[PDB]
Design a protein around this ligand. Structure first.
Ligand SMILES: COC1=C(OC)C(=O)C(C/C=C(\C)CC/C=C(\C)CC/C=C(\C)CC/C=C(\C)CC/C=C(\C)CC/C=C(\C)CC/C=C(\C)CC/C=C(/C)CC/C=C(\C)CCC=C(C)C)=C(C)C1=O
Ligand SMILES: CCCCCCCCCCCCCCCCCC(=O)OC[C@H](COP(=O)([O-])OCC[N+](C)(C)C)OC(=O)CCCCCCCCCCCCCCCCC
Ligand SMILES: CCCCCCCCCCCCCCCCCC(=O)OC[C@H](COP(=O)([O-])OCC[N+](C)(C)C)OC(=O)CCCCCCCCCCCCCCCCC
Ligand SMILES: CCCCCCCCCCCCCCCCCC(=O)OC[C@H](COP(=O)([O-])OCC[N+](C)(C)C)OC(=O)CCCCCCCCCCCCCCCCC
Ligand SMILES: CCCCCCCCCCCCCCCCCC(=O)OC[C@H](COP(=O)([O-])OCC[N+](C)(C)C)OC(=O)CCCCCCCCCCCCCCCCC
Ligand SMILES: CCCCCCCCCCCCCCCCC[C@@H](O)O[C@H](CO[C@H](O)CCCCCCCCCCCCCCC)COP(=O)(O)OCC[N+](C)(C)C
Ligand SMILES: CCCCCCCCCCCCCCCCC[C@@H](O)O[C@H](CO[C@H](O)CCCCCCCCCCCCCCC)COP(=O)(O)OCC[N+](C)(C)C
Ligand SMILES: CCCCCCCC/C=C/CCCCCCCC(=O)OC[C@H](COP(=O)(O)OCCN)OC(=O)CCCCCCC/C=C/CCCCCCCC
Ligand SMILES: CCCCCCCC/C=C\CCCCCCCC(=O)OC[C@H](COP(=O)(O)OCCN)OC(=O)CCCCCCC/C=C\CCCCCCCC
Ligand SMILES: CCCCCCCC/C=C\CCCCCCCC(=O)OC[C@H](COP(=O)(O)OCCN)OC(=O)CCCCCCC/C=C\CCCCCCCC
Ligand SMILES: CCCCCCCC/C=C\CCCCCCCC(=O)O[C@H](COC(=O)CCCCCCC/C=C/CCCCCCCC)COP(=O)(O)OCCN
Ligand SMILES: CN(C)C(=N)NC(=N)N
Ligand code: SF4
Ligand code: SF4
Ligand code: SF4
Lengths: 70, 170, 318, 215, 156, 115, 176, 96
């Protein structure tokens, strides 16, 4: 009957899950467990560069705060 | 030589490797190829001939060609740019050894190179196609059957008489 | 790690294309009272694998009259652009985050047109030429209408960024905002992907397999893969553009599940339409877009320019 | 060619996609049926008429039988005549299903083909039950019919005929008022009544042109 | 041996795909092509087995010669057969393709398509039922299953 | 950089597929197999002969309208201006002139294919 | 009598004009066709599971040929050549002579199954029910020569299929 | 109800004698229906009937895994049925 179409749709859906979930996981992996920084403008890019400079490890996602100012 | 042969297809498929490597530039090799239909007709007539029981025949073509002239004519009929260059025998043997490591059907082999360089023997004592009743077909009449497949679309429709026959050595 | 991400975007798409072929065969079979493939594997699950292996182990031939260089380039261009169209799609995070993600889609589609033209011309056959010129006319009509519709809907958005599309559709659906443009967009995507009733470049009834009549074995399979990847990609773009899913930044799998479900619904609707309707005539396709869609499209473009101004709802630029 | 019915070679002159002339080349399925019929007897020539129009087989058989009976000066019995008319109408249903669905397939629709071909399969079962052959029955013969109906055939034909109007309705739901079907079929191949009569058309060609004629 | 085992498994894989994805060319000549339509029909769905009609000979694996082959058609049949790329198979359906048929002693008919093309399966009948043609297709699949191209090559 | 790498990956995968397709299978080529396809008979003419285009005018109009839409594309950013009245007037002016072009061609029968 | 298939004119009231305009702008009949196809999707398929399920057949079906015997084992065929005479396709070849016991029996009985048109005239013309067209239809071969049956092959077919052949003839002999 | 459909599916799973039998019938017959056993021939073929199914699908055969001298686990022909069951399966009679 018509429900024999479902396993093929299930396989196709499982295949379409992989790209988005993989991109999310790789974004969190290479950005310290946080969302990848969106830099659509020069201001955002300069913020990222300053974050890289202040981190001391040449990585913008390593965030520093009050424990670093004093 | 015929549609599915090695001879004309072996010489006409060398266009992929740039130029045409010839030993002594193909000036020391004389060949008289024979046509496949003549060979098969002679084989059939030898079965039907009652006085060919324990004999030896030589199936040869009407015209003898130098290898350089023959290959130049092959390339002229195929309408391919013919750029022959000399290749010393040891280097050609090395190249043939390179191609015979193929698990599949090799493109060329050392024995193939030796056979290509070798001139065809003349055996006037042995009978032949005329003795079996066959008039040998010249290469100039059947070469376009084989070599038209190797032409490009620009030259596919060119007729048989558009290429002057090669010089023979008779 | 970015190469790993590229592979994670490419390989699942090709697998989805194969099983889309299986799903289309079975859906059409059940709509035609048949069953479709159910013998090769469990419920015919190994059918795409069998077909792919057969096609890539069969002999490909170059016609004696063909122009070999563009005979080979055309499937390469088709499949490469089919795989490239997926890189700016947010699911919910794009592989490549572009400021102008929509114009990139338009440009790459317009480029992917030329694979059909060059494969038809390089084949050097009359049926291939007829299919190529049908492609020319089809692209004329759908291209102008598609550009205007996209302009209007993205004018309701504020920019050409698809993540901004998600943010825009946070609360309701662009299909609730602009359903007429949604209908015309769906029809235009059918015409763009060469799906029935607009499968005129490869029209079996009139032309024997249309533009890829001279293609065999692997190079034919590349065109098939490219066409089905384009179908899925256009449905994914439509789902992102009009059926906006809710996004939770801490659990992005929910958006991915919603996006996949909406994409599958639209793709199955494509298959449904193919089962249901006859085929157009390409002159009637040209007259449909220009004489019916283009006037309404221009009027709706004017309406959607004026509406944000007259109601003080102009979207933010970023 | 899918739209050439297998053995038609249409040599067309096209200006672009506009047809300048159609030059049908037939004879690719010419066998010599008339010469062979000359060499056969009257019973041996009946399957030849089965295989001429292989979609209206009992109809071709009936035409041949009527001709031979007219020359013989005999008369089939009433039950034979009613069986002939019944199976001629069953054959007309088979042929019209084939014609409409193949026409729609050439246009671009295929599901009506599949549905109505399931119906064709049931009518083939009727053919096979009376004759033993699914299509080339050789059942209607000069002098009547070969054998009598089995003892459930009329009930089964009644069931089929009872459930067939719904199939025609479903076929019409996909084509009759469909705007794509109307764009493809309306004002295409218009033939005037005088032209039809002079060219020698018969049947639905005349009746579409508006001529009130039916044999 | 290891290589013998590997080539056996490889050609099993290659034969499985070819037998499980059969693409007949849409090529019908006469009344036998109606039974082919009924094999395509819902009752004996051929697409269920992996058998799909394609219009272009370049994208076809099987030629089902279904109908009477005439002298005016034999060149066209040979031409499309040649334009089919290899591996390619032929199923001759019905009496008219198997031999002459009802038209054997005729000036205009070729007595069997096997005078023109190499035929792999012969399906008898006038016309063979859709089940008979399906049996012939399955017999063709079983014949493909016994091919050992890589096994011959390894021992070659 | 990332987009260049993505394009390179896609092109390389497609080229590898073509290479596998043309080198894995057994090949047998002869003049009859590689002949052009025209339904079983030989082509009378050549496929390189001129092929009349019945919609030559619609193609030129397509060029012009394509550049009209190129003009229209920067509208989403134009909506952020302070001169909203001027922006709206000019946008509607362009769209009305496009509509006028369509109306003129439609009434003058430019949309009808040549016979 | 006759009827017109397309001779009606639409009503021009404002309601009807608006309904037609809605059908034009909102694709009502197209959605109706979609609904019909969806209904078929949720119906049950008509496909049988060949080769484990077979289509219906009748006692009158004409399949592979067979030569029958009397219950004693004696052949029914008396070499009368009526089947050879009536065969439309000239597919039967028969040669006979007196047997060692003086019986009128065949020495050659060939049927070219590639020439046969499976019309069943031979079993109508047989006065002793010797040649029959049995129920077997799955006998496709791999070579042409295997389809040129002879007397040994046809007698083997009769011996293999005799039970079913007898049952079918019993079921259908009162209609003959 | 979906529950009834799932329960009938589970009954089909348990009707073939465990998961292995269900998978075997699924892979060598492409169907997992259960019907009453009408009989079995000397070659191992089993014959099943279900009058609730529509005509054509109300009788079926599960072919043996070894007939004569051929291993028929996968390669199963339609000609493996002896003539009496051939007649019954093709419905030339109602009596097994
Ligand atoms: C001539 O007269 C006649 C007629 O008149 C014309 C007739 O009408 C008829 C009657 C016939 C009809 C009426 C037929 C009409 C029917 C229709 C029109 C509808 C029927 C349906 C169709 C025609 C549809 C046809 C569709 C086809 C054929 C598609 C099949 C093709 C394919 C499947 C090939 C393309 C797919 C490919 C190539 C898949 C490729 C996938 C990949 C490469 C993905 C893999 C990628 C990788 C990188 C691999 C690695 C992956 C890994 C490693 C992941 C694994 C990891 C894990 C963890 C698992 C008859 C008989 C006739 O006679
Ligand atoms: C061009 C691409 C470069 C990048 C490649 C990146 C990786 C590609 C991965 C996909 C591989 C696709 C192939 C799959 C099939 C595997 C078998 C295969 O490849 O067979 C190939 C061919 C097969 O020959 P074939 O043509 O008989 O193969 C037909 C296919 N079979 C038989 C398998 C069905 O194998 C060989 O050629 C190997 C034998 C030795 C040949 C020696 C050649 C020497 C070099 C060539 C030039 C020599 C002259 C130079 C002149 C100038 C010198 C200065
Ligand atoms: C290492 C790789 C080596 C090979 C590279 C091959 C490249 C070939 C194409 C060259 C032109 C495109 C790349 C230009 C350089 C990078 C530009 C860049 O930085 O873009 C960032 C921008 C970023 O997008 P953006 O618009 O959002 O940028 C603003 C936002 N910031 C600044 C924050 C990024 O990318 C794009 O806009 C994407 C545009 C892609 C345009 C491609 C045009 C050519 C298409 C050719 C298709 C060929 C198909 C295959 C054919 C095969 C036939 C056999
Ligand atoms: C002339 C008629 C015009 C009709 C215009 C509307 C056409 C709608 C076509 C929908 C096609 C859907 C295809 C994909 C199906 C996916 C199913 C799925 O996952 O659903 C779960 C999804 C849930 O996943 P979700 O997260 O994507 O949904 C909410 C999405 N946000 C909030 C981000 C916008 O949808 C729902 O459960 C709710 C759907 C509606 C959401 C919008 C707000 C409510 C609007 C209510 C008023 C509606 C008035 C009109 C109603 C009558 C119209 C005739
Ligand atoms: C799905 C999309 C991607 C597809 C990728 C490839 C899918 C298929 C993978 C399995 C292929 C198995 C081998 C089939 C080869 C063709 C058969 C053939 O031509 O036989 C006739 C020929 C017969 O040769 P012969 O010498 O007997 O014949 C002489 C010529 N005639 C016929 C005229 C007498 O077979 C061969 O030549 C055998 C060559 C070696 C076969 C094995 C080598 C390939 C191994 C593949 C392993 C996978 C990795 C590499 C491949 C690419 C993928 C990464
Ligand atoms: C979110 C989770 C990730 C999802 C990823 C989705 C990926 C889906 C991949 C496809 C899954 C469905 C296909 C497999 C279903 C059928 C498997 C099984 O049922 O088939 C059996 C056969 O198993 C198959 O070999 C399984 C193949 C699985 C690999 C192919 C799927 C991926 C395609 C590309 C693979 C490329 C890498 C190659 C890996 C080998 C047949 O049973 P049987 O009748 O008893 O065979 C007996 C024959 N013998 C005796 C000779 C052996
Ligand atoms: C799309 C991307 C693909 C990329 C390439 C990767 C390929 C992935 C591998 C796919 C494997 C598919 C396996 C197919 C399983 C066969 C199913 C089973 O039924 O086959 C049986 C056995 O088939 C063959 O004996 C074996 C075919 C499969 C085994 C191939 C070899 C093993 C595959 C692994 C690759 C080889 C590498 C080995 C080491 C080099 C015969 O059954 P069959 O008669 O048809 O069914 C008829 C239908 N009935 C039952 C209803 C009547
Ligand atoms: C803006 C147009 C004026 C520009 C004039 C330029 C010089 C003249 C060259 C022609 C260009 C314009 C041609 C457009 C009209 C020509 C077509 C025509 O004759 O008919 C128009 C046709 C009428 O149909 P029929 O003639 O009856 O044919 C049907 C028969 N069954 O339809 C029309 O009227 C369409 C006319 C253009 C549509 C847009 C109308 C514009 C109204 C908005 C005001 C524009 C003001 C511009 C400032 C905008 C500020 C927001
Ligand atoms: C320079 C770049 C080298 C080009 C690499 C190879 C290009 C592809 C070559 C190719 O595909 O054709 C080779 C071609 C294919 O044969 P088929 O027609 O397929 O016959 C099979 C019939 N069943 O093989 C041949 O027959 C050619 C054999 C002659 C080779 C002679 C060797 C001498 C060439 C080397 C010179 C270089 C020296 C330095
Ligand atoms: C150019 C890159 C080298 C390609 C390999 C050598 C080229 C070649 O021989 O052509 C192979 C084949 C066609 O060969 P035929 O003309 O049909 O005759 C020979 C059959 N083997 O063409 C190819 O596969 C090209 C490979 C893809 C090119 C990728 C470039 C991007
Ligand atoms: C408060 C003021 C608001 C102002 C806005 C008012 C707008 C709302 C009312 C107007 C909306 C009209 C809808 C616009 C779309 C109409 C398209 C059209 O022109 O209709 C058809 C054209 O459209 C078609 O014919 C469709 C053909 C292709 C159909 C095949 C697929 C369609 C079936 C699938 C349904 C699609 C569902 C869309 C879902 C979208 C999901 C994102 C007319 O063409 P013809 O009948 O041939 O006659 C014209 C010349 N005499
Ligand atoms: C080949 N035959 C018999 C057809 N009916 N063909 C068709 N394309 N409709
Ligand atoms: S074998 Fe019989 S049914 Fe088939 S084409 Fe010939 S006459 Fe027609
Ligand atoms: S069935 Fe007809 S064609 Fe066949 S042998 Fe009997 S009489 Fe001859
Ligand atoms: S009609 Fe019967 S008895 Fe007479 S020759 Fe033929 S098979 Fe024998």
């Amino acid at each position: 009957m018509w429900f024999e179409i479902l396993p093929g749709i299930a396989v196709m859906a499982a295949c379409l899950f992989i790209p988005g979930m993989a991109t999310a996981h790789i974004h969190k992996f290479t950005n310290g467990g946080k969302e990848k920084r969106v830099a659509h403008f020069s201001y955002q890019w300069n913020l990222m560069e300053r974050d890289r400079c202040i981190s001391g490890v040449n990585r913008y996602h390593v965030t520093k705060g009050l424990e670093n100012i004093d | 030589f015929g549609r599915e042969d090695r001879f004309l297809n072996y010489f006409a498929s060398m266009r992929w490797f740039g130029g045409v490597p010839l030993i002594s530039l193909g000036k020391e090799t004389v060949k008289q190829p024979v046509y496949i239909v003549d060979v098969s007709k002679g084989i059939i007539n030898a079965i039907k001939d009652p006085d060919a029981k324990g004999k030896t025949f030589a199936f040869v073509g009407p015209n003898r060609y130098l290898l350089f002239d023959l290959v130049q004519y092959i390339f002229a009929v195929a309408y391919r740019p013919f750029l022959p260059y000399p290749l010393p025998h040891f280097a050609y043997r090395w190249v043939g050894r390179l191609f015979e490591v193929s698990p599949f059907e090799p493109w060329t082999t050392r024995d193939k190179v030796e056979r290509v360089h070798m001139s065809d023997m003349t055996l006037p004592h042995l009978p032949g196609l005329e003795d079996l009743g066959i008039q040998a077909t010249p290469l100039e009449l059947k070469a376009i059957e084989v070599l038209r497949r190797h032409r490009t679309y620009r030259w596919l429709t060119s007729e048989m008489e558009d290429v002057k026959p090669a010089k023979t050595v008779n | 790690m970015f190469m790993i991400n590229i592979l994670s975007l490419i390989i699942p798409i090709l697998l989805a294309v194969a099983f889309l072929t299986l799903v289309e065969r079975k859906v059409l079979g059940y709509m035609q009272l048949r069953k479709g493939p159910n013998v090769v594997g469990p419920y015919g699950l190994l059918q795409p694998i069998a077909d792919a292996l057969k096609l890539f182990t069969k002999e490909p031939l170059r016609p004696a009259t063909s122009s070999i260089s563009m005979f080979i380039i055309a499937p390469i261009l088709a499949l490469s652009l089919a795989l490239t169209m997926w890189v700016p799609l947010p699911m919910p995070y794009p592989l490549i985050n572009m400021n102008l993600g929509v114009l990139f889609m338009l440009a790459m589609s317009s480029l992917a047109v030329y694979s059909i033209l060059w494969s038809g011309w390089a084949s050097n056959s009359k049926y291939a030429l007829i299919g190529a010129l049908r492609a020319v006319a089809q692209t004329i009509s759908y291209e102008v209408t598609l550009a205007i519709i996209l302009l209007s809907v993205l004018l309701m958005n504020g920019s050409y960024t698809l993540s901004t599309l998600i943010t825009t559709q946070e609360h309701i659906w662009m299909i609730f905002t602009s359903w007429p443009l949604a209908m015309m967009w769906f029809i235009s995507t059918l015409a763009e992907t060469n799906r029935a009733p607009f499968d005129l470049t490869e029209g079996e009834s009139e032309l024997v397999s249309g533009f890829n009549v001279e293609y065999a074995a692997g190079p034919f399979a590349m065109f098939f893969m490219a066409e089905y990847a384009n179908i899925i990609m256009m449905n994914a773009f439509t789902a992102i553009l009009f059926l906006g899913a809710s996004h939770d930044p801490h659990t992005p799998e929910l958006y991915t599940i919603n996006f996949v479900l909406k994409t599958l619904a639209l793709t199955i609707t494509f298959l449904w339409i193919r089962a249901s309707y006859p085929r157009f005539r390409y002159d009637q396709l040209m007259h449909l877009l220009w004489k019916s869609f283009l006037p309404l499209t221009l009027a709706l473009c004017m309406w959607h320019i004026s509406l944000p101004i007259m109601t003080a709802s102009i979207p933010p630029q970023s | 060619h899918p739209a050439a019915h297998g053995v038609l070679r249409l040599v067309m002159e096209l200006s672009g996609e506009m047809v300048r002339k159609c030059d049908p080349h037939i004879g690719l399925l010419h066998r010599g049926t008339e010469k062979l019929i000359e060499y056969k007897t009257y019973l041996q020539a009946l399957p030849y008429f089965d295989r001429l129009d292989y979609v209206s087989m009992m109809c071709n058989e009936q035409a041949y039988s009527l001709a031979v009976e007219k020359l013989l000066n005999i008369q089939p019995p009433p039950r034979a005549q009613w069986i002939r008319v019944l199976f001629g109408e069953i054959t007309r249903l088979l042929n019209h299903i084939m014609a409409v669905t193949t026409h729609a397939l050439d246009i671009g629709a295929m599901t009506p083909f599949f549905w109505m071909f399931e119906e064709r399969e049931k009518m083939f079962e009727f053919y096979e039950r009376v004759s033993g052959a699914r299509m080339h029955a050789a059942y209607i013969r000069p002098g009547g019919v070969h054998q009598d109906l089995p003892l459930g055939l009329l009930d089964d034909i009644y069931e089929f005929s009872k459930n067939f109007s719904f199939r025609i309705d479903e076929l019409e739901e996909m084509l009759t008022n469909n705007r794509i079907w109307r764009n493809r079929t309306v004002d295409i191949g218009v033939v005037t009544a005088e032209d039809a009569l002079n060219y020698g058309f018969s049947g639905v060609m005349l009746r579409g042109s508006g001529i009130q004629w039916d044999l | 041996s290891r290589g013998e085992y590997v080539v056996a498994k490889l050609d099993d894989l290659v034969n499985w795909a070819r037998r499980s994805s059969l693409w007949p060319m849409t090529f019908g000549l006469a009344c036998c092509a109606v039974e082919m339509m009924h094999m395509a029909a819902p009752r004996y769905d051929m697409d269920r087995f992996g058998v799909v009609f394609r219009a272009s000979p370049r994208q076809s694996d099987v030629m089902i010669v279904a109908g009477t082959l005439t002298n005016k058609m034999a060149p066209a049949l040979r031409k499309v057969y040649d334009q089919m790329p290899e591996p390619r198979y032929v199923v001759s359906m019905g009496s008219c393709a198997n031999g002459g048929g009802y038209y054997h002693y005729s000036y205009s008919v070729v007595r069997g398509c096997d005078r023109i093309v190499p035929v792999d399966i012969y399906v008898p009948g006038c016309p063979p039922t859709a089940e008979a043609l399906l049996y012939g297709i399955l017999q063709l699949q079983r014949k493909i299953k016994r091919e050992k191209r890589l096994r011959i090559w390894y021992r070659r | 950089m990332n987009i260049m790498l993505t394009l390179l990956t896609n092109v390389t995968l497609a080229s590898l597929l073509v290479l596998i397709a043309f080198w894995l299978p057994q090949l047998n080529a002869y003049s009859e197999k590689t002949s052009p396809y025209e339904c079983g008979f030989d082509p009378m003419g050549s496929a390189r002969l001129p092929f009349s285009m019945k919609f030559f005018l619609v193609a030129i109009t397509f060029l012009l309208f394509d550049l009209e839409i190129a003009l229209l594309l920067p509208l989403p950013w134009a909506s952020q201006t302070n001169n909203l009245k001027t922006m709206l007037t000019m946008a509607l002016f362009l769209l009305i002139l496009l509509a006028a072009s369509l109306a003129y061609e439609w009434t003058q029968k430019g949309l009808e294919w040549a016979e | 009598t006759y009827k017109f298939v397309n001779m009606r004119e639409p009503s021009m009231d404002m309601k009807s004009v608006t309904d037609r305009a809605a059908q034009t702008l909102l694709w009502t009949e197209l959605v109706r066709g979609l609904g019909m196809t969806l209904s078929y999707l949720f119906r049950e398929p008509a496909t049988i599971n060949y080769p484990f399920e077979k289509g219906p057949l009748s006692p009158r079906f004409r399949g592979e040929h067979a030569l029958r015997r009397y219950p004693s084992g004696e052949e029914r065929c008396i070499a009368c050549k009526l089947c050879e005479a009536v065969c439309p396709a000239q597919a039967i070849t028969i040669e006979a002579e007196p047997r060692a016991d003086g019986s009128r029996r065949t020495t050659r009985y060939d049927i070219d199954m590639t020439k046969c048109i499976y019309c069943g005239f031979c079993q109508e013309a047989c006065p002793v029910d010797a040649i029959v067209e049995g129920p077997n239809f799955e006998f496709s071969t791999e070579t042409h020569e295997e389809l040129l049956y002879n007397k040994e092959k046809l007698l083997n077919n009769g011996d293999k299929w005799e039970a079913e052949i007898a049952a079918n003839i019993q079921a259908d002999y009162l209609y003959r | 109800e979906l529950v009834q459909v799932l329960r009938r599916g589970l009954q089909q799973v348990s009707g073939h004698g465990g998961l292995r039998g269900y998978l075997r019938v699924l892979f060598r017959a492409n169907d997992v229906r259960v019907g009453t056993l009408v009989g079995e021939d000397k070659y191992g073929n089993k014959y099943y009937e279900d009058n609730k199914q529509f005509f054509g699908r109300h009788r079926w055969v599960i072919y043996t895994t070894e007939m004569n001298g051929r291993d028929t686990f996968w390669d199963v022909d339609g000609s493996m049925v002896p003539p009496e069951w051939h007649r019954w399966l093709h419905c030339m009679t109602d009596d097994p």
